Structure formats: C-alpha cells, structure tokens
Write a protein that binds this ligand. Structure first.
Ligand SMILES: O=P(O)(O)OC[C@H]1O[C@@](CO)(OP(=O)(O)O)[C@@H](O)[C@@H]1O
Ligand SMILES: O=P(O)(O)OC[C@H]1O[C@@](CO)(OP(=O)(O)O)[C@@H](O)[C@@H]1O
Lengths: 498, 498, 498, 498
C-alpha cells in the first residue's frame, strides 16, 4: 500500500544517479541569449518552448538559432517546441483608452463591429462573433484574467447582450475574455497559427504544443495544416478548457501527448478541480503510453526570488508522483530573475521525488490496465522491464528509429535508465519529452545500416558505461528485433557487461 | 489502486456537505481585532495560534481575549494554541551596526562573551556557548536565514572557530544561526518559555505547539513545566530539525500530536527532503491516532495577492491527500493583506481534495497497521466505522469527555461527519485539531450526568439533523458505553433517525 | 496465498479444542437401537437422518423415539431430519421375473400401462408417463444404477420408444431409471411424500432433506405442503440432477440450505463434474450464509472395513476445506459393520483439516462478497468476528431465538467457538447443521424473559468456561440487542472473563 | 479469490485441446503384454513403472522390452521407471505356518536370529536388528498392514521386547512391520536394491522411484550407487514415512523430484494427515520447479469395477488442483480388470479439472515465491510465460537438451501447450513426468547441430501446427539462446505463425 511504503522512506536516502523526469523551459527575454541558454541546458533543460502568443517569427527565429547553437556547443540534443498563440477572445477599445466598471451597473456587450473603437462602460465590443449563440441568461462572462465578472441577463438583440456587473473593476483596451459555462467554437487554428504552423515546419521544429484543444477533429485539422512535410512532428495537446477535459479520451487517441495547461484551465474550470483533472489526465496518458506534461505556476515565486515556497516544492514533487513525463517552466524562465536557479531547483525536487517513487508498483499497475492480448512488441517491452526488476538490471538498451519503441518501454517504468539508440536526430530531440530515457545517435550513413544490430547495441552499452550506470558484471536488458523481423522489436536479451 | 481510482474522478463531482480538515491561523497585527477574528472564524478558522517569538504576554493576552470574545459572539468554540519562541542561536552585535562578509575571506566566530557588542567581519560572537563542542571541521554554519554560509576550518581555541566565508553577504546585528549537520543541545525550554508556559496555563490555553523538539525527554520536560494545573493541555510537537526527525517514534509516543514545521525544517534539512519527511510523519501520526499538522509557506503569495499560485494550491491539496488533520497559516494571516480570502481559499481546496480522497482505502490501510490484540474500545471504533461503510450511514455520534474516544474514531476515517458529544468545553476546543469531527457541548451541571446516555445521544443526533447531515430514515452509527462499563466505550449501535 | 500458507503447516501441529464441522448419520438397521444411537452421539453425530425411501412410517417412528430417548439420556440435543423418498422412475416387471439385454439388440420402451406386468427384452414398461415428451433421438436412458445404457433411436409411437442396447446387462424387475440429458418433470412431491411431509410435521421433525429439487417453485410447493404447522421446519434442498444445478441461485434463495447429493448427481452429471459442482455450491451457500452439506461415498469402504482408504480421508478433508458446514454418512451408518468407528474417523479428519484451515482468509473472502449496504445486524456480526481476530478472543456468545443470529455469525468464520444461547430447543437442534456453533438452552418460562440480557449472557459465558474455551482474563465477544431494539442484534461487546 | 472464481465455472465449459497432467502406470500381469501396453499408451500412459518389490530382473526385463516395442510401434517415447523394493522389516516364520494373536495377551518379539524359523504366539522374530534401540516403552509396533497392533511394554533383554497385544488377529509367516513413532535406520539401499540399481543403469532406465527416502544423505547414496554411467538418471524420492516428511526441504534439494507415496505414508502417519502432507509437498515441489507425483488408491475400485467411486474421482481432480505434475496407477493397472478404462477415466478427470484450474493465479503465485534476484534463464522463462498471457499465445516452444529449460518453463504454468525440442531421446522420456510439456526429438547427427536455432524452432512450430495448437496468425512464444550465449537460454521471441 502507499501507506506502508511511506513508512519505509527516509529523508537521508540517497538519490539516484539519473533523473527520469524532463524539464521544459519557455524562452523569453531573460533566456534568449546563447549564454543564457547554455546555462539552462546545464541547469537541466531538455526542451525549449517558444510561445507564439508573444514575439514574432523574427523573434522566435532568433530563439531557434540560439538553441541549436547552444546545444551544438554543448554536444547535446534539445527539442524545440512551438507553442501557438491560438484563437483568442478579446474586447475592443474603450473611449479615453479606459472604462470604469462598477458593481451593480448594467452594461451591453456587443459583437457589432461598428463598436470596436468606441466602447464605453455602457456598451462595448467583444470580438467573438458567435458570443450570443454560445451564451445564455445566467452564464458568466469573464474579462481581464477573470477579474471582472459580468453576468448575462438577456439578449438585447441578436448581437448584443445586456449584462449585470457583479464586481467592480476598471478595464483597459482589449482584455481577454473567457466563457466558463460555454462551449467556445473558435476554429482550432487561427489565421496567424496557420502562418504559425507553416513556419514551424519550415524551421524544422520537433513538436507543437497546440493551444486550447476542444476536440479530436481539431487535432486532425492541426495535423493537416502541418501537411506532408510536417508528418513527423508531434502534436502535443494542451487541455485548457471544459470541452477539452470532456473529450479527453478521443483527444488522447488523436494526439501524440498531452499538456495539463493549468493556467488557462484554472480560470475555465474551478481551480479546485484542476487537481482532479491533473490526476486523471496524467493517468490516462500513462496508461495509453503517451507523454504528459504538467504546466504553469509550478515555481512561480522564483520568477522573483532565489528560493521557492513550500507549496511550490510540493507541487513539483506531486506532479512526478502523479506520473508526469514532464514539468514545465513558463514565466520563471521567460522573464524571471533566476532562470538557472529555478531550473536547478526543479531538477533537484524531481530527483528527490523519484526516490520516493515506487517504480515497481507503477509498472504493475500500468501492466494490469492493458488490454489482453495487445501486441508482440508491447509484450516484449513489458516483460523486458519485468526482467529488469527480476535481475536488478542497472540499465536498459533499446533500438528505436521512430522513437516508438522507446516510448513503449518507458511506459513500463523500469527502475533503471533506459538507453535508446536511434538513427534519427529528431528522434533524439522528440524523446526529450519521454521520462526516463536517454538517446544515443547512431549515424547510419557513416556507420552503415547495422542489420545485425551489434553496433547499435555496443554503442548503447558503451554510453551506459560512460555515464556510469553499469560496470562489468552488471546486467543490461536489451530490446530489438531478431534477424528476420522488421518494423518492431520482437526480442529481449539479458546480457552481462564487460 | 490509486491509479485506477484517479480514473473515476471528475472535476464536476460535487463536493461534500462537510469539510473534514481543520485550519489553523496565526494571529498578528492583521488579525488581532475582534472584527478580524470574526472574519477568520466565518472564513473557516478552527484554531488560533499565538507565536511567542513575537509579541509579549501583554500582546498575546489581547489576542486571547479577543478570540474568546469573537467566538462567544458567534456561538462557537475556538481552540487557542501557544506557540513558543523556543531556544534561539543568535550572533552578537557588529561595530558600526553592520558587517560586510566577502566570499573567500577568513573570519573567527567566538563564544567568548567579551565580544557580544564588538564583533567585526574579522571576529564576532555567536551566543550558543556549546558551539565549539557541537561543530567539527567541514561542518557548515548558517547565518541570516541560511543566506550566509560559513564553513568551519578549525578550532582557533577552545571558544573560537576559524571559518571560511563560502558566499558574499552583508549581515546586520543579531542574526539567527543554524547548524545543519549538528546536534544542537539547547534545553527544551528557555527561560522565557518557562515564563511562557506558565502564562499559558494561567490563561487557560488549549494546546502548546512546542518548538524545536529534539527528544522524548524534552517533551517530558515540557509536560513537567506545565505542571499539575497544566495536565490536560495538549503538547503538540513541532519537528523542525534533524534530531527531531530521527527521534520521531519516541517523540510521537510522548506527544499528543505533531507539527511538520516546514519553514525551519527546510533549512535544517535539505528542502527536497521535507517532502519525504512530510509523508512519513503524517503517516506515522495517522497510524498512531494522533493529530498531525502541515505547516508553513502553504499559501505564501496570498500574503500579498488576492489569488494563490498553482504550486500553492497543489500543496494544500496534497497535504490532505497525505493524511493531515490540519493545515496552517502563518504570515498570510499574521501580517497579510487578505486574511479572510486566504482562509477561504484554503477551506475550498481542502473540500475539493476531500472529494478525491479515498476514505475507504484509508480506513482499511490504517486498520491493517494496528497490532493485535489492541483494545476493546479500539475495536469498537474501527468496526463501527466499518458499519458506517456497510450501511452507508450519513453520520456518526460519539460520546467523549476526555476527547479520547473521538480521536479514536476519527482515526478510522469514516466517510461521514462525526459528531462528538462532550461534557467539557475544552474538549470541544481541543478537538478542533482532529479531522472530521464536530463537537456538541452537553452541560452536565445543568442537565445532569446522563448515565443512561440517552440525552447526550439525542443531542448529537439533533445536531446532525440541524446541520443537515441526516434526515429521517437515515442511519446514524452511535458509540458509547453500555450501562455497566466505565472509562471507555464498549458499544456500537446502528439507529434509524426520525 | 494458499501456497505460502501450506508452507507454514506442520503435521505435528496440535489440533483444536473444538470441532467446527458437523456430522450427519443415516439411521438404519445397524443404528436404530438406542444403544447404537448412544454410541453414535458419543462418536460425534449431531444430526440423525431418516430416509423415507426405505422403511415406513412405522419403522421411522421407532427411529424418532429412539433418537429422542438416546439424546435425553445423554443430555444433548440432536436434530432429526426427514429424507424423503421423492419421485422415482422405475421399469415395470419382466416375464420370468428377469430380462436379458444384449449389446447391439433393439428393444422398445413404452409407457403404455397395459405392459407393467408383461415386459420382455423386446418391449417393457417405464412408469414415467411423460417419457416420450422429455426424450429425443440420440438421448440416453439409464437403467439399473446407470449400468444398462439404452440409446433412443426413434418414437415407434406416441407412448413407445425404439431403443438400441449399447452394452450387455441382465436386468430384473422394477429398476430405477435416469435421464441424463433430460429435464425430468415429475412433481416435486409424490403422493407418498405428501403423506411423508405431514408425518414429519406431526412427529415434530427439525428439517427436511428434500430430494431431487429441480426448481425454486418446487421448494415453495414443499413449504406449502408442510403448511402453517410446519413453518419453522427447515427445508434443505438436495441437488442431485442437472436442473437443480442449473437453477441453484434461485433454489438457494428459496431454501434454508443445500445438500450436495453426490450419489445421484454422479450419475446425472458426469462424475468428474461433481467436483466443480461441489466447489460452486458450497461457496454460494457460504456467501449466502446458509448451511451446506457434502454427501455420499465419503467413507464408503468403512461400510465393511475398520479403516478408510486414502481417497476417502482426502475426501472428508477437502469438503471442509471447500467450506462445508456438514459431512454426511449414508450406508456406512445405515447398514455398516463399524458405525461408531466410521463416525469417529470422520470427526478426527474434520478436526485435522480444521487446523490447516485458514479461518482468517475465509472471513475476509466472505466479507468482500457481501453487497453494501447489507444490514445492521450483518455488520454487527461481521465486525464482531473482526473483533475476535483483533483481540484473539477465545469464545463468542450470541443470543438467538430463531437461530438466525447464530447463522449470521457463523457465516463469518471466527477462529473460536461460537456459543449460542437460545430460548428454543428446536433452535438448538436446527443449529446442529451450522458449523462452529454450540447451543445452550435457556428456559424462558422457568427463568423469565431476560430482557436486559444479563442472564442469557451469563449462561453462555459459563458454558464456555465449562467446556474450557475460556479462563479468567480471556476475551469473550458478545452479540445481542441493546435495551431498546427488538428483532435483531444491534450490539457487540468485548468482555473480560472472570 | 478462489471463491469468486468458482462462481465463473460451468459444467458445460468445453475442455482443452491438451491434457497437461501426466499418467503413470505400474506394469504387472494384466499389462505386460505388448498389446496391453499399446492399449495403455493409447489410453494415456506416459510413464511405465516397474516395481522391484515384485518380480525379478527377468520379469522386469520383459517389461522393458515390451515397453520399448510397444512405444516403437506407436511412434512415441515412453519413460521407464524403476521402482525399488527397498529395505523391508518382516517377521520370521511361525510354528505350524501360522500364529493366533489374542487381544490382552503378552508376547515377546525378538531379533535373536535363532528364532527366525520357530516363532509362536509367545515369542517370534522380527528381522530388523536395531528394533530394540529404535523403540521405547509406549511405542506401537504394527504387523500385517498395520492390522495387528502390538504395544511395547519393556525390554525383556537386549534383543527382546515384551509386548501387549492390543487387538486380535491371526498372522501368518513373514508379515511386514511398521514403526510409526520410530525413526527406522535401515540403509537407503538394500543389497537387492544395489543389484537393482545396477540393472537399471544397464538396461538404460530413465528414472528411479526411490522407496522409503528418510534423508538427503540417502539420496546421495543412491546417486552414488548409480555411478558415473548413471548420472543422467533422475532420482525421484518417495515420501512414505515420518522422517521423510520431516526432512522434506533437504530431500527436495538433493532429489530431481518427489512422490507422495500415499499407501505407506498412510500407515506411517495418520491418514488424515496425508492430506496436509500432500498439499505441502506438492507446493514445495512447485515452488522449487521439480516434478511431483500423487500416488496410491487414486482409482482403487476400478481394479475390479468398470466405474469409479465419487471419492475417487474427486481425488484425481484435487491432486491436479493441488498442483501435481503426475498421477499414478498401481494395482489398478498391475493386476486389475480394466486397465485401459481406468487410465481413460483418469485422463478424462484430469482434463476436466484442468478447465477449472486457474493457470494464471498459479503463475503469479509461483512467481512471487521466487527469490530475487534469481537467474537470467529463470527470468526469461517467467517473463516469457507472462508474454503468453499478455498476447494470448496458443503455444510455446523451448529448446532443451538436458530438459532443464523445459522444466523451468513448465514451472510457470502457461495456459497453453509447451513444446520442447530436444536433441536427446532420453530427455523426451524424462520430460514425461513434467506437466504440460510435449517433446519433439531433433536428431543432431542426421540434421546437424543447428547453432542458429532456426531448424529446431521450425520443428517445434510445425509440431504445434500439426497437433492443432496453432494456426496462421497465432502467436507462438519461443525460448532459446541467442547466437553468442551457451548453456542456457537468454532469449524470448514472440513470433507470428504462418
Ligand atoms: O523505430 P522503432 O519503430 O522504435 O523500431 C525499432 C526496432 O526496429 C528494428 C527492427 O527493424 O530496427 P532496425 O531495423 O533499425 O534494427 C529493431 O532493431 C528496433 O528495435
Ligand atoms: O471521554 P472518553 O474518554 O472519550 O470517554 C467517553 C465514553 O465513556 C462513557 C462511559 O463512561 O462516558 P459517560 O459516562 O459520560 O457516558 C461513554 O458513554 C463515552 O462514550
């Protein structure tokens, strides 16, 4: 039981020689410079995130170049993620630049575009043309981070809503709005996103963090916008609203992974619910074998302070316990004072939680949840991990070119490092969101196709020796195909290391 | 499994009609006024904490009077806790008021009292006379919140340590020091504490939060200082250092409960370890049936902001999941901007986590950990809870005068409110640190001794009806003695409510 | 696991001071005499069975009188069971007294009553008028213990079946027939049974072992034949054919208990299946809380020999492991050479298996299978047993007048004797089929109604002292109502014995 | 739970396409002829047992030749087992050929050899020279199958015991004696056995069923008598007395397997205990991975009747449920009326029990009991079976030359047939005592050493196709070494069948 086990823990237990969980950093003004990026990598960053809500192609290009240059200098592979601006609902302008909303007052919100540059406290524009169809009397309309809460009373006309102001707040031009009891039906991809997705393909980004995913159909639309050139880019779906949570199984099916986008989700859904949503979404991703990310306000105070709050530390740790592949940094690295320190703190917490983690229970729990039968490669991976626990093997080596084999193994939560040997560099980057995995690139061109698998295997083992995971006399559990089979791994071997 | 179960959760699940967890508030300048206190109670405060590190008997008296007056006005019983200053290690004074410590420099720390008003960056006084005996070469000496880290190189003489300065920092007069690899042997109770403990007895406080508990022997010394007059005051032991963690079983034995004092513990022990310590200590308290409190930096940002960080919310929730009876507020209520809001937020998070909580697994887990044989009353309580789950009983009533019976029941984590009927008002207050329990006072003097137990039972049931926990046709599971037995409860009944 | 546990067993483990399982003996020519019956009781008989297939009211009356006289002399209460003849299918007479059936031959079986005294190997009568409607081409018709197997080829006419003889066998007048792939639709109760049931009511028998129960409807018909005068007589349903097995849940619902009637079942169903049927039926009875009996050929060789076969000993033991309340003796006591010895052997085996029995796993297993909620009295019994395990209580006392409370407790398999205090003598007899229970009669008339329950309780405890189950300082777990509640027991107490 | 599961069973469930359990037949006058043996094999015999207590080398040779000739004709491999006479304790002769022992009488038992041909009811010879040293006053001495029970009163002298006769019985010349509370210290191997063991080596028998094994030291003595020429012959140790049961772990260590020799054990140990001993011994063998046999009186009545008793059928079934590799036939095939039928009945019961068997629980239960870590090949086998359950693989193929690999796999109880491909014919025979395994011989000489393993693998798969275990599209889980490793199998593959 989790209880009994808590009882076996000690604060003085030594931590592991490897950190399974992966850290994602958003790149902003604090972290754009190659020197800053180098600091981040050394501090522990595996994925760099660009938020297309901010900046421009020009700004983001600089980031891409800088990431590649910094990584190259440090001899490492870093995933690059494009985080779309996505569809937004905004108010228009107010006369005098500003508008003073008092509690108890009546105001009128309209989608009549005549009003975009002449709102007043009395009547102003919200730019979502379907506002009236989506909202009903009683529904709430949040403006300015959810700070100003208007309540919908009636349809003055087909484009205008009569509202009550429920609390006082001055609002300036063009605030964002939310609609918590409302199924928002903006397209999956805005016009800027479209230009945003193409750019991502062009500059060869590894993954897309797709904002605001309402549906399985929307993911497909994203896949389709990426096109043929974009087929191997991973689409990670951010769950930030009600519809996304509701549609999670279908979204998970379509996607390559999930982000638990807590900041938006937190407004959209009452905040106390975000915890249940985190546990559910992470678990469903774990069971499915797809990467899952916990995001937002994880170490927020460290945007300005050298040290985190107790609640924050607890939060990074619980996300790992929850089963997340990744934790994420937003403002703390984009605009913060202590970018290197925040990352270093997060890594340290992740390592500590990892000691407490019962990797074994996790393996068995996951294993019971799989449909039987399933697939030959899946059985190979699961049983191979079981072999790891049975022999106390100190490392694992897998051959994956797509990266599929590696996710399938990592999914089973072995208690040792997993070493993936890949013939694709992008695969090395893409695997930066999978917990517990390290990649070794094997250049097929220079070194040949390695059909008998002996070379790739030697390289993974050597890498394991090099990082100190194994010494002679240790077991290493190895996964690939035999000589005949193609397209998956049908074999496991336990080899002694010399 | 915890996994499978996460899968059954929903964000839209309705929360409970009762909140099990209890909130503790520290009373400072923001919250001293009767009006402020009334706001706190309404917001959800069950225990008011006075920190004797700050203020004076005079200041704290005002708090006591104000708490009682506010509670009286609201018709409620609020526990009063005395939080001792405890033994402190401080530096002396520096010449010019200040002293500029540079990285790489050598300085001398002495316990020679000749130096208390004439330290300099070169040599200054630390007021802990045993410093030299407790520290060895290689050990670290933290000054100013742990900001300035000196390392011990050698014993210049029997009272003076030659130190290296490991990082730059200007330090002013009389900073606190810590000794993380060091067994500090200050007495359990300072001279001020002694005057502090007596005052607490005199003003009739409910509990002591005893700072810095190193040992079982120390608790006894506290018990002894309280004296005969003080025998029914609960001693809650704060675990804030290494020795306290190491000695936890024996401390738990001696104590009436534990506090996981994260702020001090966090310096003393590396911070990433505080998480393991939290899980262990809470669990050991749950298994033992004694109240456990999670403290410090739980909603820290709310000292200054209307809304919490994501890490903070996650932290309050995980503490409940961890199994804590209580969560605590420190600065957020002592000196904060939004005292009512912070408490309201904490209560709301606690209620939400409670939905996710698997009360049933918790009951069984706890039950397996008890040694056999145990005790007739313990079996009665455990099996009575089992009855609650078996019938789906919506309330529970227990008779306790000492409060013992009530803790014993609450310990088994029923999924319904527990209603305790007590003949002692102090018991009603003392039970404010036990999760899931509500007290009804029955005035033996006015209403008689009630030996057949029918009256006390009627009152608990009526209270349950009144708060809406039960309606006619519901089961209420009831615990007390039969007609012969005295000193414990040997009986359980399932009664139908009319 | 059952495995690990087998590992903790030893042949030299001392057996218990009590035998939980109950033994049933069929009374025949060997055992009718009062002296023989006295030997049987001393040897271990708790229930005496009269088989109404044999004997007459006159013969069986002698048995009843003798049982009562023997029991009275020995100061004990013995249940009396009436085992009905039930509906039978028989052939008619053959010419010359006999008829020689050869393998490969054609013969004709008819229900034309003209043929009842003039069958021949060529054509003879079977007295079940529905034979033709119930059988189809391909079905088998067993005659003479299943020794002669005819196969049905066709309907010669509406009353006559053309058969193949599948194996050679000479058959004499009036052999029994079976129909293994056939739903036999004889009435539940024959005309003789009807006279048989009334007689049982008149002579005040404790239970009916109702032969050949096909259906829930049939049990009701039995209940109805017993009438109002017969309402408190238990109907134990013997499962001896296909339909009975198929309809077991509904039959179990209607019944007061089950017999696994292996001898008939063994012909009807292939023999290798009887094992699966035994395990299922016993388990379903255990889960339901109703008494279950394992019957037939249990110690068969002991009909003629002083000592049993290995297979036999294993069989009595496995029935206990299976979870049976009772084991039964048929021919071994009805017509056998060593009636006392066979019973003594069975008792000894039962005691030995009981040591190996994991009473605790059995308690938990049963407990998990109950639907929540269930009932206040059921929770009281289950949790009270849990109390027994938690304290290591050496005895249990329950108050039951109907005997209901006692079955409910025994159902939970405590590891100590259960002592039932009853105000009905019939209850003491009826409880002779419930494992692990001993009855003390309390004469309400002589000693009063005992509403405060103190007297009945003292008597059960004294009885426990007397048989040596408890000594001073031992715990005894006690079950009854409190002062208000009537109709069930809502209370448990753990009392110390003096 | 076993309970819940019983609930999922049905009598109409179809049985498997394979029978896991193996049947052993003792060859006597009824079964010696090649035609009889052919009938036995077809009926289901996998092992033929020769009992060297009866017959002579000459008689047994005929059996060996006949077995080989019958097997050869049927194209099958049948194991040959030599069942030793072993050490015996016998009385001497009585005057007049006979001696009439009355209850209550005093008689004298002596080891003075002067008395071997002149015993009388007054004084006679028992031929075990250590009788006096091994027995004490109070001990029992059984003569004639345990029929005549003498009790030891005193040592008349150093070679003679004064006895009471406890029950009447006429005894003739040279009856066997037992000593149930006595540690008998006959040598492991008699002089005839020695000639018996050598003969077995010479005629190339597969295994020895070693009678009466008291100790681990004794097994070694057997191993040593077999010699170098005899090194690959399996020693199966029969547990027939107290000492053997007591010393079971050490005996199991030394042995290649166990027989639960119920007929002797049943006298030696009280019969009701044989059940506990059966469960323990079988389980310990299962956990250890060594073959275990259940023996004696399993279908005894079928020595004379066409059909078994209910107790008998239950007995064969429970032995399978117990976890036995093998069931055995003794008299039923040696001297019986219906040798083919008895075997056919046993096979049928075994198949039926197999349906009820929870192979999966058995796999997991066994797996938990293994020490971790263990061995690379052991993990390969266990995890490979886990693969079978995960994919629903319908067959398994293993390469074993010693037969070791095959036992290791079978040990884990897969729910599908296991097909072993071996280069040794003796291995094919020896594997006839391992449940759930079928052997295919691959002639290394004719077909080469097959180092890449492709041929042996093709043959096992083809055999599986041929018996219908697999069709195209099915998974077959395959076990052997990779190209480098020698002496064990380090590899598992899941292959699709075409
Ligand atoms: O790229 P994924 O899809 O993970 O497939 C990798 C697996 O396929 C194989 C077999 O085709 O690749 P490879 O041909 O490169 O050797 C296995 O060796 C390898 O483990
Ligand atoms: O105060 P604690 O120690 O909890 O004891 C309370 C129990 O004792 C009893 C019995 O003595 O008190 P009471 O006399 O007040 O009725 C029980 O009724 C009650 O449940």
């Amino acid at each position: 039981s989790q209880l009994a086990h808590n009882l076996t823990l000690s604060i003085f237990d030594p931590v592991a020689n490897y950190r399974a969980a992966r850290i994602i950093c958003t790149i902003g003004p604090s972290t754009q410079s190659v020197e800053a990026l180098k600091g981040l990598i050394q501090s522990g960053m595996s994925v760099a995130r660009m938020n297309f809500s901010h900046g421009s192609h020009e700004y983001h290009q600089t980031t891409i170049n800088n990431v590649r240059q910094a990584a190259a200098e440090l001899g490492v592979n870093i995933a690059i993620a494009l985080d779309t601006k996505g569809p937004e609902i905004r108010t228009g302008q107010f006369v005098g630049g500003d508008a003073v909303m008092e509690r108890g007052a009546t105001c009128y919100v309209t989608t009549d575009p005549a009003f975009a540059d002449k709102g007043t406290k009395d009547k102003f524009y919200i730019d979502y043309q379907n506002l009236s169809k989506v909202v009903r009397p009683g529904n709430y309309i949040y403006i300015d981070d959810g700070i100003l809460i208007l309540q919908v009373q009636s349809h003055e006309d087909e484009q205008t809503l009569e509202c009550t102001v429920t609390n006082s707040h001055t609002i300036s031009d063009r605030r964002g709005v939310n609609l918590p009891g409302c199924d928002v039906d903006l397209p999956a991809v805005s016009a800027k996103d479209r230009v945003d997705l193409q750019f991502g393909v062009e500059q060869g980004v590894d993954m897309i963090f797709a904002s605001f995913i309402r549906s399985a159909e929307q993911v497909g639309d994203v896949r389709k916008a990426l096109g043929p050139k974009g087929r191997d880019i991973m689409i990670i779906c951010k769950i930030e609203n009600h519809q996304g949570v509701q549609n999670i199984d279908s979204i998970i099916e379509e996607s390559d992974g999930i982000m638990v986008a807590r900041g938006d989700l937190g407004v959209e859904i009452p905040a106390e619910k975000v915890v249940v949503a985190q546990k559910i979404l992470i678990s469903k991703c774990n069971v499915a074998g797809k990467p899952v990310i916990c995001a937002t306000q994880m170490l927020e105070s460290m945007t300005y302070n050298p040290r985190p709050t107790r609640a924050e530390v607890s939060d990074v740790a619980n996300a790992v316990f929850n089963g997340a592949d990744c934790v994420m940094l937003s403002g703390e690295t984009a605009k913060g004072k202590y970018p290197n320190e925040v990352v270093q703190y997060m890594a340290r917490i992740c390592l500590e939680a990892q000691s407490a983690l019962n990797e074994y229970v996790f393996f068995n729990s996951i294993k019971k949840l799989q449909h039987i039968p399933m697939s030959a490669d899946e059985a190979v991976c699961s049983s191979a991990v079981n072999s790891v626990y049975e022999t106390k093997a100190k490392a694992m080596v897998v051959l994956s070119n797509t990266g599929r084999s590696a996710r399938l193994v990592a999914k089973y939560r072995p208690n040792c490092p997993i070493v993936c040997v890949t013939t694709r560099l992008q695969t090395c980057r893409q695997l930066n969101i999978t917990q517990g995995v390290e990649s070794v690139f094997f250049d097929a061109d220079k070194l040949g196709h390695d059909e008998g698998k002996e070379h790739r295997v030697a390289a993974g083992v050597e890498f394991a020796k090099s990082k100190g995971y194994v010494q002679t006399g240790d077991y290493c559990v190895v996964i690939h195909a035999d000589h005949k089979v193609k397209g998956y791994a049908n074999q496991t071997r336990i080899l002694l290391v010399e």
